C-alpha cells in the first residue's frame, strides 16, 4: 500500500532512474508501490587448500535476521554453526572470541578472522593495535642508554617493467584482405597505440639508466680484503 | 669514526669498541641471507610486475574467441558462409570489439607505467641520498640512526641494505638544568648534567660517559636568580 | 551479454585493487609506532597547556576538542550500514539517492580501521612525543623533562638554551595563546576544509551520474528492457537490447577509468602525508618550508 497523493489524472509514478515504482490498480483505484525483493553479495573466507577445506560465508551489508536461507543453490548450515553480526553484514561458520590477536584475514570494521588450533577451527576477533606501554614521566628524572646495537635491514624497490609491442593488422584481421580494407577507413587509432607503446618502452630504459648510472668511473676493490675486521 | 661523529657520538667510543662493533656487523650481515630465504613472501613487489604483465597478455589473447554478436568468431568461416554485402556487417562487430580490447589494454599499461615511474624516481632519490652520503632524515634510510647503505640488483628492481645504530640498556638518573656556583649559573656546552645520588657529572646525550664538571666544558652567561630548578654545587678549575 | 568477453572481470579486479589500496594507504599513514603509550595522570609540563589536543575522557568517543570540531565540520554522507536494505524498504515516501544506487547494484564497503582506532593511534603518538621527545622514534623511549626537550630543540636551530631558561614563562604564554587561537581560526573560516569535502563531493557526483545514465535510450525504441521484450518478437529484440548493453558497458568503462586516476592521485597525497608524519612529528626537520613557515620546532 502506498501513501503517495496521486492526482486524479495520474496513473504511474517514476523515480530518478526512470523506473516505475508506483502503480494504480485498473479495477480498484488504489495506489500501490513496488520494491525489489532482497538481494546482496556473498564472500567466502578460507585458509589455503593445503591446510584444510573448511570455509566461512559473509553476507555483505545484510542484517543477519531475515537471512535468505535462492539464487545460490548450496545451503549453509545457518544454525548450529556460530552466527555473528558485524558492521559488514553477517558471518556464518566462524566463532567469536574475546582474545585479541594481530589481524590475519581482514573482514570489516575492526574484525579479523584466523585459523586456530584451539581441534582446528576458524575464529573471528577484534584486531589489536599493539602492546600497552607507559613511560614514567617526571620533571627531574632522565634516562640515558649504556650500550648499543648495530642493525641491518632490507628494502626492495621495483624499477622497470616489460616492454611489449603489438601489430594491429595481424591481431584484428589476421591475413585477410577484406578485413584490412574495412579497417583502413576507421581512422588512425593504431598509430596512437603504437606511439603510446613506444613511449612506454623508451621510458622503461630511461628509468633504469637514471637509477643505475649515478657514477661514471668504474672503481675496483683492492686485491687484499682486510678492512679492520669487517667482513664484506 | 666520522660516521659516528655524524650522529652525535664521539669517536673514542668506536676506537675502544672496534672488535665488538665488527662482530655485531658480521652477525647482522650473516643473518640477512637466512632472513631472506626463510620468508617466501619477501619479494612480492617484484613478482607482482611479472604476474600483472602475464595476466594482461593472457587476457588479451583470450579475448580473441568472443563473437561480439556475430554468427561466428572466425573470419574465414564468415567469409565462406556468406556473400560480401552480408559479410561486412558481421566483420564490423568483430573489428569494433577487438579495437575496444586494444584500447583498454593500452590504457591499463599507461597507468601502470606511471606508477612504475614514480617508484623508480623514489628509488633513484634513495640511491642518491642514502648510499652516496649520510642522511639525517628520520626513517628515510632505515629504522634508527642511519650509518651506511649498500645496493644490490634484483630482477626488475633494487635492494638496499641499511646499517643503523640503536641504543639499548638505559638507566635512570637525576638531572638539573643549571649549576649554581659563586653566584653564577653554569650550563653544559655539549651534554647534560647527571647525578648518581651523591655527586654530579656531565655526560653526552646518546652514551653514558661521566666527566668531572669543570670550567672547560661549561659557560656562565647569566645569574642565579632566573633559572627554575637550579642546583648549586662546586665547579673545578 | 555472456558472449561479449571478460570486461567485467577486469572491472571487478580494478575495483578490488583500489579498495585494497585505500586500506594500505591508511595503514601506512597511521601505523608508524607499535607501542600504545599513555599520558601520565598528572598534567603538568612546565607551564605548557595541552588540554586542547589531548583526548577528553568525558565524551564517549574520546576525542580532543579540535578533533570534535574537525569531525563536525565535514559531512560524511556515504558509509557502511547493516540492515540498509530494511531502511530502504521502510518507504517513508522520501526516496533518497542512496536507495536508488543500492537497487541498481552499486554498494559501498566500510573501511577496515574504525575512527576509534585512528584516535587511539593519534593519542599514542601525542603521548610519546610529549613524554619522550624524539627518542621513541628510533628505539626505546627515554623520558626527559619538557623544558629540557625544548632547550634541545632551541639548540637545534642555533639558539643557546639559556635564552629558553630565562624566558620560560613568556614562551609558555605565547604557545598557549597560539594554541587557543587555532579553534577560532578553524571555526571562523568555512572553506578551510575544502580538500576533505572535495573527495566526498566527487564520489557522490560520480555515483549519481552513473545512476542517472540508466535512463538513456542509446538509439533504441525504449530504455526499459521489459517494454522492449513485450512489444517485439525476439529476433527484432536482440538488436534493440545490444545498443543498451553497449551504452551501459561504455558508461562503466568511463567510471572505472576515472576512479583509477583519482586513486592514483590519492595515493600520491597519502605518500606525502606519510613522509610528513615520519619527518616532522618523530623528529626535528632542517628542510626549509617543509614543516611550516619559519624555523621548525615541533609538530
Ligand atoms: C653491550 O652489549 C654487548 C653485546 O650484547 C656485550 O657483549 C657481550 O658480553 C657478554 C658478557 O661476557 C658475552 O658473553 C657476549 O659474547 C658479548 N657479545 C658479543 C657480541 O661479543 C657487552 O658486554 C655489553 N656491554 C655492557 C657494558 O654491558
Ligand atoms: C667472511 O665470512 C665468510 C662467510 O661468512 C667466511 O667464509 C667461511 O670461512 C670458513 C673458514 O675458512 C669456512 O669454514 C666457511 O665454509 C666459509 N663460508 C663461506 C660461505 O664461504 C670468511 O672466512 C670470512 N672472512 C674472514 C676473513 O674470516
Ligand atoms: C657516585 O659517584 C661517586 C663518584 O665516583 C662515588 O664516589 C666514589 O665511591 C667509590 C666507592 O664507593 C670510592 O672509592 C671513591 O673514593 C668515591 N669518590 C669520591 C670522590 O669520594 C659514589 O660512590 C657514587 N655513588 C653511587 C651510589 O654509585
Ligand atoms: C588549559 O586551557 C583550558 C582551556 O583553554 C583551561 O580550561 C579553562 O579553565 C578555566 C578556569 O578553570 C575555565 O573558566 C574555562 O571554562 C576552562 N576552559 C575550558 C575550555 O574548559 C585550563 O584551565 C588550562 N589549564 C590550566 C592548568 O590552567
Ligand atoms: C470491475 O469489476 C469488478 C467485478 O469483477 C468490480 O468489483 C469492480 O468494482 C469493477 N471496477 C470498475 C472500475 O468498474
Ligand atoms: C536486525 O533486524 C531486527 C529486526 O528488524 C532489528 O531489531 C535489529 O536492530 C537489526 N539489526 C541491527 C544491527 O540493527
Ligand atoms: C567477552 O567479554 C565480555 C565482557 O563483558 C563478556 O560479557 C563476554 O561473555 C565475553 N565473551 C564470551 C564468549 O564469554
Ligand atoms: C614538578 O616539580 C614541582 C616543583 O615545583 C613538584 O612539586 C612536582 O611534584 C613535580 N612533578 C612531579 C610529577 O613530580
Ligand atoms: C627507571 O624508573 C622507572 C620508574 O621509576 C622504572 O619503571 C624503570 O624500570 C627504571 N629503569 C631502570 C633501568 O631501573
Ligand atoms: C644552595 O641551594 C639551596 C637550595 O636551593 C639554597 O637553599 C641555598 O641557599 C643555596 N646556597 C647558597 C649559598 O645560597
Numbering used by the authors:
A (entry chain A): 554 to 622, 629 to 677, 689 to 802
B (entry chain A): 903 to 1139
C (entry chain A): 753 to 1051
Which sentences from the paper describe this structure?
At the end of 2022, the XBB.1.5 variant emerged, a descendant of XBB that acquired two substitutions in the spike (S) protein, S:G252V and S:F486P (S:S486P compared to XBB.1), and a translational stop in ORF8 (ORF8:G8stop). We determine the structural basis for the interaction between human ACE2 and the S protein of XBB.1.5, showing similar overall structures between the S proteins of XBB.1 and XBB.1.5. Our recent report showed that the S486P mutation in S is a determinant of enhanced affinity to human ACE26.
The receptor-binding domain (RBD) one-up state, frequently observed in the structure of the SARS-CoV-2 S protein, was rarely found in the XBB.1.5 S protein. In the closed-1 state, a structural difference between the S proteins of XBB.1 and XBB.1.5 is the distinct loop structure consisting of L828 to Q836 within the fusion peptide (residues 816–855). In addition, R567 and D571, which have no interaction in XBB.1, form a salt bridge in XBB1.5. Another common feature is that the closed-1 cryo-EM map showed higher resolution and well-packed RBDs, while the closed-2 cryo-EM map showed relatively lower resolution in the RBDs than in the whole map, suggesting that the RBDs are mobile. By cryo-EM analysis, a structural comparison of the S proteins of XBB.1 and XBB.1.5 in closed-1 revealed a difference in the loop structure consisting of L828 to Q836 within the fusion peptide (residues 816–855). Despite a structural difference in the fusion peptide portion, which is essential for membrane fusion, the overall structures of XBB.1 and XBB.1.5 were highly similar.
